[PDB]
Ligand binder design. Structure first.
Ligand SMILES: [Cl-]
Length: 175
């Protein structure tokens, strides 16, 4: 088990644009494109938004995709996105010291959070980050669950939290 395998389990693999729980058009292995409008929005607005997502995807791939990509292209965006999450942690003054304090398995759990919510978002979990840096694993686990993150994607947040709690890959075994 490694960060790629871990995120592939959490993000899945879809070859056509879809909308995630936070209302973002997404594709591949968790590659975020752009925001979608309201479900009422406007027939006009919806088309506009879909085309904006397709335009984002075309720019990312460098080809006219019309919203569909191959598995190889999804894995390329995934390689870029994992690299970006790590670079985001290393350039961030709040995240880098926590990352440096962690063992390899827990480092993967932090990269997973950053991949899902971005650098700025995770850097704002000040209390949980302090607990992690102090190796207060159970406290960190309890604190991390008191979040919109956990309430919105509980099964995935539980796996990530169990990873911080135990420093093992148990939550991803048999998945
Ligand atoms: Cl603890």
């Amino acid at each position: 088990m490694n960060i790629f395998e871990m995120l592939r389990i959490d993000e899945g693999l879809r070859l056509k644009i879809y909308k995630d729980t936070e209302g973002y058009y997404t594709i591949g292995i968790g590659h975020l494109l752009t925001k979608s409008p309201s479900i009422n929005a406007a027939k006009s607005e919806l088309d506009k938004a879909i085309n904006a997502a397709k335009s984002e995807l075309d720019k990312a791939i460098g080809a006219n995709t019309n919203g569909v990509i191959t598995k190889d292209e999804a894995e390329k965006l995934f390689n870029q996105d994992v690299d970006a999450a790590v670079r985001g942690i290393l350039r961030n003054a709040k995240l880098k010291p926590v990352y440096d304090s962690l063992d390899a398995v827990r480092r993967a759990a932090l990269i997973n959070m950053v991949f899902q919510m971005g650098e700025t978002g995770v850097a704002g979990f000040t209390n949980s980050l302090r607990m992690l840096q102090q190796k207060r694993w159970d406290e960190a686990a309890v604190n991390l669950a008191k979040s919109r993150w956990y309430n919105q994607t509980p099964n995935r947040a539980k796996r990530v939290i169990t990873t911080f709690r135990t420093g093992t890959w148990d939550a991803y075994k048999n998945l």
